[PDB]
Amino acid sequence: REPTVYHIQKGRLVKMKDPGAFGRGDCYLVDAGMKIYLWIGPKSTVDEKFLTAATAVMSDQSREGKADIDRIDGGNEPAEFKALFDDFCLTDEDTEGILKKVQMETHEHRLWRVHREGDETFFAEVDLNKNSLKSDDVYLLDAWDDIWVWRGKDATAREKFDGNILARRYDAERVGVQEIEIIEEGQEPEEFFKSFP
Amino acid sequence: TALVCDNGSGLVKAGFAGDDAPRAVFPSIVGRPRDSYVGDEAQSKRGILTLKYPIEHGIITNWDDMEKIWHHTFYNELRVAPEEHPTLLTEAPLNPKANREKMTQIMFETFNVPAMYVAIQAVLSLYASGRTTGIVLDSGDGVTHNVPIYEGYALPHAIMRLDLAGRDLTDYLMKILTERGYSFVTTAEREIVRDIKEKLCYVALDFENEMATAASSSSLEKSYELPDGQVITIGNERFRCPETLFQPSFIGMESAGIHETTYNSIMKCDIDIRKDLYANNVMSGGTTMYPGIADRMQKEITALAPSTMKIKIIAPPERKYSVWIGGSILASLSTFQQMWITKQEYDEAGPSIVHR
Ligand SMILES: Nc1ncnc2c1ncn2[C@@H]1O[C@H](COP(=O)(O)OP(=O)(O)OP(=O)(O)O)[C@@H](O)[C@H]1O
Numbered sequence: 001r002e003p004t005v006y007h008i009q010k011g012r013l014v015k016m017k018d019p020g021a022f023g024r025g026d027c028y029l030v031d032a033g034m035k036i037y038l039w040i041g042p043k044s045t046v047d048e049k050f051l052t053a054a055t056a057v058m059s060d061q062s063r064e065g066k067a068d069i070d071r072i073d074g075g076n077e078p079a080e081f082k083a084l085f086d087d088f089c090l091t092d093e094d095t096e097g098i099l100k101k102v103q104m105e106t107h108e109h110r111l112w113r114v115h116r117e118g119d120e121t122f123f124a125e126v127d128l129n130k131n132s133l134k135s136d137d138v139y140l141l142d143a144w145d146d147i148w149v150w151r152g153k154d155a156t157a158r159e160k161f162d163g164n165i166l167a168r169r170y171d172a173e174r175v176g177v178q179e180i181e182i183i184e185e186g187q188e189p190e191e192f193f194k195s196f197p
Numbered sequence: 198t199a200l201v202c203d204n205g206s207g208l209v210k211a212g213f214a215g216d217d218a219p220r221a222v223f224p225s226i227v228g229r230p231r232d233s234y235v236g237d238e239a240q241s242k243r244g245i246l247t248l249k250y251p252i253e254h255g256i257i258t259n260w261d262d263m264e265k266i267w268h269h270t271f272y273n274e275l276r277v278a279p280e281e282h283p284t285l286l287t288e289a290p291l292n293p294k295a296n297r298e299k300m301t302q303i304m305f306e307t308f309n310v311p312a313m314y315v316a317i318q319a320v321l322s323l324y325a326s327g328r329t330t331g332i333v334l335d336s337g338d339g340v341t342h343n344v345p346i347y348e349g350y351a352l353p354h355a356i357m358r359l360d361l362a363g364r365d366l367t368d369y370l371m372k373i374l375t376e377r378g379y380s381f382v383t384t385a386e387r388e389i390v391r392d393i394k395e396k397l398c399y400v401a402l403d404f405e406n407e408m409a410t411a412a413s414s415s416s417l418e419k420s421y422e423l424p425d426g427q428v429i430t431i432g433n434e435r436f437r438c439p440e441t442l443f444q445p446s447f448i449g450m451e452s453a454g455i456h457e458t459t460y461n462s463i464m465k466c467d468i469d470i471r472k473d474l475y476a477n478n479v480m481s482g483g484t485t486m487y488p489g490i491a492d493r494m495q496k497e498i499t500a501l502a503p504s505t506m507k508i509k510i511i512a513p514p515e516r517k518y519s520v521w522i523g524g525s526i527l528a529s530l531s532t533f534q535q536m537w538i539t540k541q542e543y544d545e546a547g548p549s550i551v552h553r
Pocket residue numbers: 204205206207208209254255335336337338339340341362363364391394395396481482483484485486487517
């Protein structure tokens with residue numbers, strides 16, 4: 001373990017006192033002077049790969065660009081890379097990433113009226129409250145992880161059609177799985193009414 | 198908290214640094230009467246407005262409407278006070294110096310941001326893949342770019358452009374689904390075409406064999422169910438649509454496909470570094486999301502590459518938003534606060550400090 005290694009942990013570079021072991025879930029910056037290695041674990045996350053690459057260029061431009069950056073895929077290391085260390089090995093260590101899933105409080109939810117006069121379909125934001133759901137239109141409740149299509153008792157078939165489709169596009173935009181729920185006026189579950197503040 | 202806005206030709210991506218996904222995504226469209234309507238409302242109000250794209254091929258062209266995009270990003274979609282947050286912007290390949298001083302000036306004088314930074318989309322996606330060196334294929338809504346990057350720096354002389362991307366594929370898919378006997382005129386019906394594009398289309402490994410397979414059976418046909426229980430049935434259109442990326446002639450474009458523009462981009466770099474680009478082809482952008490595209494690229498660049506050259510195509514799982522996620526990491530890293538441009542320096546050096 002002659003070369004200086006920086007282990008990626010939670011958006012910072014911690015330099016190890018004894019390099020050599022490499023965790024499959026993590027990323028490392030191997031600094032060996034004029035050669036700089038990005039060791040990228042096959043199960044590492046995007047924040048870890050990113051800091052490794054950005055830090056390398058910073059290290060390289062720190063040394064007037066003379067250094068040579070290479071990338072090593074973990075688990076397919078070249079023999080000359082492994083011999084850099086007294087006894088190199090692979091482990092299953094995985095420091096969790098920094099990036100968080102977005103979470104919305106109920107008061108951040110947004111309610112939207114879907115009304116078609118005869119020519120065109122309107123999509124408007126309305127005050128976030130049960131007292132905004134009018135029986136004549138369709139209302140789309142954006143609850144981040146959940147999308148509710150509320151069909152008033154007197155909505156047009158096409159307002160229910162269109163409102164359903166723009167719910168599908170909410171789910172297409174957003175990472176992960178969003179549950180779209182078609183609910184009828186007078187049949188809406190407890191969980192829907194809770195999505196208002 | 199910092200804010201990350203990735204301004205694209207068809208879609209604005211915006212959210213908070215530290216988030217793993219952008220929470221605001223809306224069309225980069227502004228509609229004025231035949232005083233302004235922005236984003237989804239602009240699209241929805243299609244029958245009575247003129248829709249303009251302020252960004253064309255990743256470069257900003259209509260400044261007035263761009264501020265309405267940014268105004269709409271801050272006040273309507275994220276509902277934040279720009280005076281409260283350092284804001285990270287992104288920029289296209291070959292973005293002229295003047296455009297980006299103008300991005301800076303507008304940020305500080307119109308939106309009074311405390312600090313800002315402009316990062317290059319291709320490098321963000323490359324870093325996000327775990328690379329300092331590679332050739333990025335960036336296929337978005339309005340433009341496809343081949344961006345060779347050597348150890349953190351794009352090579353401007355070798356950058357290739359294909360005036361073709363997701364919006365032409367949507368339009369082409371609409372055209373050939375019409376030839377099946379369907380109609381797509383209203384706003385909801387146009388979203389169905391684009392929803393079908395993003396869910397059932399794919400790039401075939403060998404096109405003409407896929408056409409034969411589609412002709413000799415209904416093996417590859419797939420059905421898209423509409424809210425009212427109707428079904429839209431699609432056969433060789435699943436792969437004819439994204440095939441356009443490899444055969445631009447499908448939409449009447451006399452251009453080389455994306456595999457050829459990748460090869461052409463590498464070939465314009467010095468012989469010393471082509472070995473590193475052939476082995477680090479990184480996909481980014483919404484249109485690099487079709488299943489089958491990497492395997493197809495691998496086969497096609499292998500057919501054009503020198504013998505014994507090692508070819509690798511990397512298609513990271515998050516490439517739909519890889520620019521924005523990269524910027525989310527950057528603006529959220531302790532090590533990067535150094536190069537935040539504060540309002541103080543802009544007061545002294547003017548907009549010209551951004552290049553430095
Ligand atoms: N699963 C998918 N399959 C195919 N295409 C998709 C998918 N998801 C999104 N797209 C397309 O990607 C495009 C948007 O991608 P992106 O945000 O990267 O482009 P942009 O940044 O707006 O434009 P550009 O990069 O050309 O300036 C849209 O056309 C969208 O239809």
